[PDB]
Design an enzyme around this catalytic site. Sequence first.
Site, PDB file in Angstrom:
ATOM      1  N   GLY A 133       0.835  -1.186   0.000  1.00 29.97           N
ATOM      2  CA  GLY A 133       0.000   0.000   0.000  1.00 29.97           C
ATOM      3  C   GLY A 133       0.872   1.239   0.000  1.00 29.97           C
ATOM      4  O   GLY A 133       2.009   1.199   0.463  1.00 29.97           O
ATOM      5  N   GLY A 170       0.436   5.666   0.673  1.00 28.78           N
ATOM      6  CA  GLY A 170      -0.448   6.719   1.145  1.00 28.78           C
ATOM      7  C   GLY A 170       0.285   8.019   1.394  1.00 28.78           C
ATOM      8  O   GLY A 170       1.387   8.212   0.884  1.00 28.78           O
ATOM      9  N   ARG A 218       4.650   4.320   2.905  1.00 29.23           N
ATOM     10  CA  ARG A 218       4.195   3.071   2.307  1.00 29.23           C
ATOM     11  C   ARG A 218       4.359   1.836   3.190  1.00 29.23           C
ATOM     12  O   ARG A 218       5.188   1.790   4.094  1.00 29.23           O
ATOM     13  CB  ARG A 218       4.845   2.859   0.940  1.00 29.23           C
ATOM     14  CG  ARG A 218       6.264   2.404   0.987  1.00 29.23           C
ATOM     15  CD  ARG A 218       6.926   2.529  -0.395  1.00 29.23           C
ATOM     16  NE  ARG A 218       8.367   2.350  -0.287  1.00 29.23           N
ATOM     17  CZ  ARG A 218       9.170   2.064  -1.303  1.00 29.23           C
ATOM     18  NH1 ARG A 218       8.671   1.899  -2.516  1.00 29.23           N
ATOM     19  NH2 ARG A 218      10.469   1.919  -1.098  1.00 29.23           N
ATOM     20  N   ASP A 232      -9.393   3.163  16.071  1.00 27.93           N
ATOM     21  CA  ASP A 232     -10.670   3.290  15.371  1.00 27.93           C
ATOM     22  C   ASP A 232     -11.340   1.950  15.124  1.00 27.93           C
ATOM     23  O   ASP A 232     -10.742   1.059  14.539  1.00 27.93           O
ATOM     24  CB  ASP A 232     -10.455   3.956  14.024  1.00 27.93           C
ATOM     25  CG  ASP A 232     -10.133   5.437  14.146  1.00 27.93           C
ATOM     26  OD1 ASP A 232      -9.319   5.933  13.335  1.00 27.93           O
ATOM     27  OD2 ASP A 232     -10.690   6.099  15.048  1.00 27.93           O
TER      28      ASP A 232
HETATM   29  C1  LIG Z   1      -1.495   1.325   6.168  1.00 27.73           C
HETATM   30  C2  LIG Z   1      -1.785  -0.170   6.433  1.00 27.73           C
HETATM   31  O1  LIG Z   1      -1.946  -0.325   7.824  1.00 27.73           O
HETATM   32  C3  LIG Z   1      -1.874  -1.621   8.379  1.00 27.73           C
HETATM   33  C4  LIG Z   1      -1.602  -2.794   7.499  1.00 27.73           C
HETATM   34  C5  LIG Z   1      -1.595  -4.154   8.112  1.00 27.73           C
HETATM   35  N1  LIG Z   1      -1.405  -5.248   7.360  1.00 27.73           N
HETATM   36  C6  LIG Z   1      -0.628  -6.318   7.759  1.00 27.73           C
HETATM   37  N2  LIG Z   1      -0.711  -7.291   6.714  1.00 27.73           N
HETATM   38  C7  LIG Z   1      -1.504  -6.773   5.706  1.00 27.73           C
HETATM   39  C8  LIG Z   1      -1.933  -7.352   4.424  1.00 27.73           C
HETATM   40  C9  LIG Z   1      -2.807  -6.572   3.564  1.00 27.73           C
HETATM   41  O2  LIG Z   1      -3.195  -7.161   2.340  1.00 27.73           O
HETATM   42  C10 LIG Z   1      -2.117  -7.923   1.792  1.00 27.73           C
HETATM   43  C11 LIG Z   1      -1.952  -7.681   0.272  1.00 27.73           C
HETATM   44  C12 LIG Z   1      -3.318  -7.724  -0.454  1.00 27.73           C
HETATM   45  N3  LIG Z   1      -4.134  -8.910  -0.133  1.00 27.73           N
HETATM   46  C13 LIG Z   1      -5.450  -9.025  -0.808  1.00 27.73           C
HETATM   47  C14 LIG Z   1      -4.253  -9.196   1.328  1.00 27.73           C
HETATM   48  C15 LIG Z   1      -2.867  -9.253   2.040  1.00 27.73           C
HETATM   49  C16 LIG Z   1      -3.287  -5.255   3.931  1.00 27.73           C
HETATM   50  C17 LIG Z   1      -2.864  -4.702   5.207  1.00 27.73           C
HETATM   51  C18 LIG Z   1      -1.971  -5.504   6.094  1.00 27.73           C
HETATM   52  C19 LIG Z   1      -1.820  -4.350   9.544  1.00 27.73           C
HETATM   53  C20 LIG Z   1      -2.068  -3.168  10.414  1.00 27.73           C
HETATM   54  C21 LIG Z   1      -2.100  -1.807   9.828  1.00 27.73           C
HETATM   55  C22 LIG Z   1      -2.375  -0.621  10.787  1.00 27.73           C
HETATM   56  N4  LIG Z   1      -2.380   0.763  10.306  1.00 27.73           N
HETATM   57  O3  LIG Z   1      -2.554  -0.862  11.929  1.00 27.73           O
HETATM   58  C23 LIG Z   1      -3.104  -0.601   5.736  1.00 27.73           C
HETATM   59  C24 LIG Z   1      -4.378  -0.454   6.439  1.00 27.73           C
HETATM   60  C25 LIG Z   1      -5.610  -0.838   5.765  1.00 27.73           C
HETATM   61  C26 LIG Z   1      -5.571  -1.380   4.383  1.00 27.73           C
HETATM   62  C27 LIG Z   1      -4.275  -1.522   3.662  1.00 27.73           C
HETATM   63  C28 LIG Z   1      -3.070  -1.134   4.323  1.00 27.73           C
HETATM   64  C29 LIG Z   1      -1.712  -1.283   3.573  1.00 27.73           C
HETATM   65  F1  LIG Z   1      -1.038  -0.079   3.495  1.00 27.73           F
HETATM   66  F2  LIG Z   1      -0.940  -2.211   4.205  1.00 27.73           F
HETATM   67  F3  LIG Z   1      -1.979  -1.721   2.324  1.00 27.73           F
END
Ligand SMILES: C[C@@H](Oc1cc(-n2cnc3cc(OC4CCN(C)CC4)ccc32)ccc1C(N)=O)c1ccccc1C(F)(F)F
Length: 253
Positions: A13, A15, A18, A131
């Site tokens: 991800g 934002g 990253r 949240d």
């Molecule tokens: C900013 C980020 O925050 C967090 C991310 C995770 N986190 C741990 N393993 C992850 C795996 C994720 O998806 C993977 C790739 C795509 N497939 C479909 C699924 C697996 C998404 C988020 C994940 C844990 C905690 C946080 C936090 N802020 O506490 C976040 C938050 C929401 C959605 C997406 C993201 C990211 F930036 F990681 F993409």
Amino acid sequence: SRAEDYEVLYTIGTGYGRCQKIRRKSDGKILVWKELDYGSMTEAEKQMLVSEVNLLRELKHPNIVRYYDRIIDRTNTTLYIVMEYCEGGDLASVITKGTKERQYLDEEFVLRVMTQLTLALKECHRRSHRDLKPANVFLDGKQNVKLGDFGLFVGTPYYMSPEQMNRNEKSDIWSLGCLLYELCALMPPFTAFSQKELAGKIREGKFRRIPYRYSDELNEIITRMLNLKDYHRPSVEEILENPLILEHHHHHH
Ligand SMILES: C[C@@H](Oc1cc(-n2cnc3cc(OC4CCN(C)CC4)ccc32)ccc1C(N)=O)c1ccccc1C(F)(F)F
Ligand SMILES: [Cl-]
Ligand SMILES: [Cl-]
Ligand SMILES: [Cl-]
Ligand SMILES: [Cl-]
């Protein structure tokens, strides 16, 4: 704690900075890290970042996303926060998927979310804010559900409670109710185009029943969490006493 102790697999991800999926060299453990550039930050802001990270490190619980490590790359002025990898991703993406695929989630899955988030909430209250919203709820590879660190203008505040509209652990129960309702219905219980219209709907306290595929017992408890009066919403304890909630709905290693 050095960056060279880990290898980046790929970015998951962008934002804030990253988030990347990474692999610990010593044992192959799969983790993620949040990459933050603090070069434009003042001492004050950098200080509020230290305390924040200190708060993340103090909460250890099976239903709270686990913090592993913090790494400072003072060269690239980058700070990495290392956390657990949640292979099922976040709940907002699960709802979106259901909405787009036109497929409701199983009651069993909704019960797991209710049980494990209510336990995360109980631990947050015990310590005393993170949240309660779908984007901040994560699923690992073993049917476990974990609350992340979000919270710890443009958007509509769909989950604000009545008493927050104007002025409480019972408010967290309302938000959890909204979250579970949206998981079931694939839409929040109160919707509107502006915050003012929203506040109007929330005050009236009316919403559709969750879909008929869900038991009257599940509808009942979600409906109770959405009571207008905070003192009629069930406590964490009263939620977990519900006959719907069984051992298998809890976390397992
Ligand atoms: C900013 C980020 O925050 C967090 C991310 C995770 N986190 C741990 N393993 C992850 C795996 C994720 O998806 C993977 C790739 C795509 N497939 C479909 C699924 C697996 C998404 C988020 C994940 C844990 C905690 C946080 C936090 N802020 O506490 C976040 C938050 C929401 C959605 C997406 C993201 C990211 F930036 F990681 F993409
Ligand atoms: Cl549908
Ligand atoms: Cl009513
Ligand atoms: Cl509704
Ligand atoms: Cl676990």
